[PDB]
């Protein structure tokens, strides 16, 4: 043994479960709200189902320049009306 | 008898804490409609 | 001299539940970041602006179709640092430009270095020979040749494999249609090493389990073994007679047997890596010139080699426009190769 | 806790059911409880299928495997396989579901309440695996039960409404079977047919008179053999050829079930008589022949002479000859010319497909049947996207024949592995070296060296 | 991009009258199309006769014209050949032949409109993918 | 000591350099027949009309093949699943044109290899061994049945069985992808884990045992001379190996029981290959890999492509080109 407390000891102790009956659901709900508030879309820049294309276009907003790539994406995002 | 905050404790939680948050994020996605 | 270096050394090498070591300073952050980046990217990040593809759980992909996809072809072989001239510190733009791909690939590469240093480090403390580290050079040779050397020979990172299940399947099929990679003898040797390794694994495991000495009374034979016993738990002599009579030849040197089990899959992976180094330059085993000369002149000459090239040609023409959107291929229906009816 | 740990029994928990080998009373409970599970699934699954069943859709569009079995027996269907009354399906499900509680009850009682061994309690129900006379007597009881079961199919066919006959003149219908085939040259002639293309061994049975008459012979044979094995004990040649132990008897059964699983796989894949395509969808050969038929019909209506249309290879575009001369459909379906089905046979003459019947006698119901089967070919993805592997999403379909064939090949394969596992173990345990080699008595050390 | 009322506006008849479907109608049309039609018409092609597809341009040149709700609803009652010369109810599913095509027995007039609407709207979404076949998959 | 008993004692003798046995009595002639026909056909057989369309494919060395392109070509699609022994042909020339040899080779081979599996059981009984080495061999054996017999059965023709050649194997794999999307099938995926995992654990076990060899030699000699065939004592220190690998991962991820270690080595590739064999055998009945073509749709209804859709494009290329002259109607239903 390496001295840490056995896992089977810890996860059958009431104190473990008093703590983690709160911390586990709290993290789950935090993750749910990251999505349900729509925050995940804006952090990572991921299209919503209604923002892949403009209403009549069918071309991909594909990046084609290396050093103006950032401006190209910003331009594609404006053209969504 | 035993400590509470060890290296093992940190290793466990750097993995377990984001896992639960991600599981909740992915569960919410199952209700997104187009 | 018991300075801070030696005190630090003491703490790093404590016998804990997770050994750390000096190698752990490199291994743990890079491994964790490479895994966390793959999970973050496959859960939340799109491939719309680099590939025209949805690629995350957020967008409705499943475990088989999510990926962290390669950057756009226009990025070349850019390191794509978050603070570099493309993303310019913008975390959201960085994600849209494919910065997670180089992030995962580069932290992964240094993470692999760290795991192999860990194998050396632990082996030196325990006092065993470092053959486990030596065997791990083959996964490193594969990772480096496929994820780094190969795109570096090509036009850009875009043509490297993307980190996802179905994305890797597309990589396999791209290699058939464009490189005729099944024809390549360096791939053939790798196939031999992988399948011969799985064979050796199966047959050595089964031979040991069916030449066990009766060292206990229970019908479960697992208990009748003690890690510190001095005797072999199975009969090498009965194993040797069985295979000599079933197969003609058999192992007789148990040390040779286990070195061979190291040798076969490791040599395989190394051979496959060399062939991919060639594909970095399109230096393919694509054709047999003698077959092409005969087939060009003799329209009744047909082999399974000529049949497969026709499949490759179908793969290239039908997948290229969608798989290489930056090229802007417009192939009218009338130019597409097709058999009758289909 | 008699034999309920590894120390007493010698078997670890993951081989825990091996602890039951010499506890006939608990072993009885395990077997009865398990039969209850089988009867439960049959009843519950039927009710699930019925609840999910829309009578206006073909059964094969709805993921049904049990209702097709009931409909084939003549319950709930009329001409053309149309569903006329879903009540028999309800009955069959409810009665299996109710019976599973009786079996569950007995199984749980014997397993945990009743006597652990039966030999002290009753010498009739008690048994010793090594008692060759008692084992063949139990075997004989079960052969008599099996024989009665086969006669129940005969009784349904001849006295209680009949069977669904896909070949019946007029599009398929329930028909009473009045003259079952009894000529043993016909019945046993099926057993000596080659299993290869155009012959098909017993999978080729193609009429109900043969099916019914074959069950008369099997019924009598089982009853007789059951009487024989009650009255006899194994002969000397048999005594010396077998291993006589519980695990050995298990292994023989596993081999038998594997064999049957593989046969069932082919039956459901090729046979369209006892697996009617009205209920199960067309076979693979059937849908492929149906495509050729559909395009022959379309092109002929446009004015093509399909008899003389030369295809790109030099073979006929629509029609060609089989290797023995029969006129057959062309294209890649040339491999399926052994297909026989009620919608196609009116076009058949002595030489195969008859060009005069093709030109003049193709009825709209045949065009309908062929277009339906061509678009319900047993191709489809694991997530039930119907069609070739390159098809887009839209059609939620996988043929019942694909579900039934794949599941039973997988089951049959693992049951062959289980036969090898337990037959090899039974041999080793009987001879006494199933736990390893005795160090002081290692046989190979007493043998001359090979070189 | 979004499923807007403009997308959902389609010709009602040959005289130029339009009708605007609801999202619920369009989605009901898609479900009913999969139920009754997609086994031969998946993607707007025709598996048992690929010469005829469900592209609006093809439907416009049918006789009588089928590129509007009334024409398509009439086709599902009494289908004809492309030139109108023959009645094909005996080999094509329709209300007239619901006895031999049982899936048509539980379609109502309101269902036919929804299916018709699906067929007219999908090309406006999918472009060439509708009726294009494998080349555009 | 009558003559039958004498023959039986020779057949089952544990003293023959190669064990014969009762399975060997079927094995030896069927494997000889298949081997001799294979070698002759591989060198000298004339071209074969595999797809039944009078378009013969050349497989042998004398007709323009090298080792990589050569094959014994599967029998004609016109034959389908019909039995075609030499005596069903009007001449040897007919038999050869129609791919007769393929049927003779694979039927003798499948018989012989099945008996090779029983022979493994049989000798283990004569030597007092445990009986399950043959269970491990059932996984490669089942794979051979899948591609030479089961897949032809479900598809209706031996012409879609795997060719007996290197490039022929590749052709089989490519068309299999087009028609079943085998990459997207979980059983092929388990097969890959079976053989990738099998190769990993092979190098793993070999490197750990080699790392903990007990010093018995000088540096000028091979360490392999430190083990002597038949010796009573183990040649490496499994406790040192466990102590290394336990610290590499964590202590409880490491085996210290050699018997369950070696059981794990046996089970992982064998179970994985069983699933691979069951993938081929179930796709034989057209229950194909996952289809996510056009699964992701935007708000308006535009198709949003995934990597699955790029795979589909590649599959379509393989589909439209394979057997370019053999289809007259639009659906490749078998
Ligand atoms: C073994 C264990 C190892 C353990 C893992 C180690 C992990 C370390 C990670 C290091 C990552 C290295 C990143 C290299 C990026 C790169 O290369 O980036 C590539 C750049 C060159 O950039 C490329 O240059 C190309 C050529 O352009 C040139 O030509 C153009 C067209 O004519 C124009 O004229 C243009 O102006 C001119 O620059 C194109 O422009 C490409 O788009 C552009 O990406 O080189 C450079 O950064 C530097 C080039 C010199 C150093 C190369 C040595 C290292 C790589 C060796 C691999 C050999 C590969 C050959 C194929 C086999
Ligand atoms: C004790 C062991 C002893 C061993 C004995 C060895 C002797 C030979 C073994 C048999 C070899 C079989 C090879 C051919 C199998 C086959 O082509 O099977 C097909 C036949 C069915 O034949 C088909 O039968 C059809 C009959 O349908 C006809 O009749 C129907 C009537 O409804 C329809 O009308 C239909 O349209 C019409 O065509 C046609 O004739 C077809 O042409 C014909 O191909 O199946 C059948 O006979 C029955 C199924 C046989 C079992 C299938 C083999 C599976 C083996 C798996 C082993 C795995 C091992 C793993 C190792 C680890
Ligand atoms: C069909 C599946 C099946 C069946 C019928 C059995 C049956 C049996 N097992 Mg086996 N076993 C199985 C699967 C099965 N097993 C599996 C999957 C494993 C691996 C985990 C094992 C591992 C195993 C071990 C290690 C052992 C057994 C033993 C036994 C026997 C005694 C069990 C006991 O005393 O429990 C007592 C348990 C209870 C009293 C708790 C509840 C039990 C009841 C029956 C639950 C049923 C509830 C049901 C819904 C009620 C319906 C009632 C209604 C009809 C009125 C019994 C005959 C034992 C044995 O061999 O004894 C000699 C034994 O040691 N089994
Ligand atoms: C009617 C058929 C039958 C019967 C009565 C037996 C009976 C027995 N077997 Mg045998 N066996 C069989 C078929 C059968 N087997 C088949 C078909 C195979 C091939 C796979 C085997 C392979 C086999 C092996 C390798 C061994 C046995 C052993 C045994 C003995 C102990 C079994 C036990 O307690 O398992 C306990 C049950 C479990 C531990 C549970 C297994 C869980 C399975 C794998 C899950 C399967 C997945 C499921 C189908 C779907 C997924 C579910 C999930 C999504 C929830 C017992 C005498 C042991 C023995 O030799 O004793 C003498 C032994 O070592 N069997
Ligand atoms: C003979 C077996 C069999 C067959 C051929 C079918 C066939 C079918 N079922 Mg039924 N069913 C069965 C048994 C079977 N079922 C059982 C045992 C249950 C209770 C769990 C059900 C309960 C059920 C429900 C509730 C439903 C169906 C439905 C269906 C239809 C769709 C199937 C599907 O999409 O699966 C999806 C595919 C899978 C889930 C793949 C499973 C992979 C398994 C886990 C692999 C196991 C391998 C092996 C056994 C383990 C070996 C381990 C090794 C170590 C030895 C199809 C007609 C559906 C339907 O359409 O009803 C009308 C439906 O809703 N079935
Ligand atoms: C094959 C299954 C089977 C077998 C071999 C046995 C055998 C036995 N049972 Mg068990 N049992 C079973 C199933 C079985 N049972 C079922 C399904 C139940 C729930 C009903 C029970 C509930 C049960 C209880 C509560 C008791 C037993 C007892 C016994 C012992 C004495 C029985 C006797 O002498 O009856 C004499 C014979 C008869 C009374 C004739 C019965 C005829 C049946 C009821 C009519 C149907 C016959 C026909 C073949 C059924 C076809 C069913 C098929 C469609 C599934 C004997 C060892 C006794 C025991 O263990 O003593 C300690 C005891 O107390 N059994
Ligand atoms: C579940 C059903 C069943 C089982 C398990 C048994 C089991 C037994 N029977 Mg019984 N028997 C049965 C049903 C059964 N029988 C029926 C229904 C009848 C009436 C026909 C008989 C009539 C009968 C007689 C007259 C005798 C037995 C005997 C025996 C014993 C010897 C078995 C043997 O050596 O077979 C091995 C099989 C053979 C030796 C057959 C020849 C070998 C050929 C070449 C194998 C061919 C395999 C091939 C793949 C076939 C595929 C299908 C084929 C039709 C084309 C054994 C205990 C013997 C005994 O000891 O009686 C006391 C005996 O003399 N049985
Ligand atoms: C296969 C059994 C089919 C089913 C199910 C459905 N359709 Fe069909 N359709 C089919 C064929 C063979 C044809 C051509 C018929 C001919 O000979 O002209 C058609 C044609 C149509 C058309 C006309 C297309 C055009 O003129 O371009 C329409 C509008 C049509 N079909 C609609 C339709 C609907 C709405 C269906 C579900 C109720 C349906 N079809 C099913 C074959 C099959
Ligand atoms: C990138 C990046 C970063 C990082 C991040 C991180 C680090 C993250 C992490 C993350 C994580 C860490 C996550 C996780 C997740 C997890 C998950 C999501 C899981 C899931 C699972 C499941 C689902 C399971 C399943 C299963 C299996 C697998 C088998 C068994 C059975 C079962 C079924 C259970 C930073 C910030 C630095 C910077 C920027 C960039
Ligand atoms: C021994 C043992 C075991 C086993 C057990 C078993 C196997 C049991 C079975 C059991 C069973 C097998 C049971 C059954 C039951 C049943 C029931 C209980 C039923 C009921 C029914 C009902 C109530 C019905 C109803 C209805 C109607 C009538 C109408 C329609 C609708 C409905 C459905 C509602 C185990 C493994 C656990 C382990 C331990 C030992
Ligand atoms: C119902 C029906 C029918 C009929 C049927 C019949 C009549 C059947 C019979 C069957 C039979 C009649 C079968 C048999 C079988 C047998 C077997 C399967 C056997 C086996 C054997 C064995 C296994 C052996 C083994 C061995 C050897 C070889 C050596 C020595 C040792 C031993 C013993 C191990 C028909 C088709 C008409 C139609 C449909 C329905
Ligand atoms: C980079 C690390 C180089 C070690 S540096 C070294 O560290 C010692 C601590 O033991 C000090 O006592 C000493 O002054 C210092 O030179
Ligand atoms: Cl065709």
Residue numbers in the entry:
A (entry chain E): 4 to 84
B (entry chain F): 12 to 45
C (entry chain D): 11 to 352
D (entry chain C): 23 to 473
E (entry chain V): 1 to 137
F (entry chain A): 11 to 344
Recite the paper's sentences:
Photosystem II (PSII) produces dioxygen by extracting electrons and protons from water, which takes place at the oxygen-evolving complex (OEC), an oxo-bridged Mn4CaO5 cluster with a shape that resembles a distorted chair. In conjunction with the oxidation of the OEC, protons are released in a 1:0:1:2 stoichiometry for the S0–S1, S1–S2, S2–S3 and S3–(S4)–S0 transitions, and two water molecules are split to produce a dioxygen in the S3–(S4)–S0 transition, after which the OEC returns to its most reduced S0 state. Here we use pump-probe serial femtosecond crystallography to reveal the structural dynamics of PSII from nanoseconds to milliseconds after illumination with one flash (1F) or two flashes (2F). We identify structural changes associated with electron transfer, proton release and water delivery at various regions, including QA–QB, YZ, the OEC and the O1, O4 and Cl-1 channels.
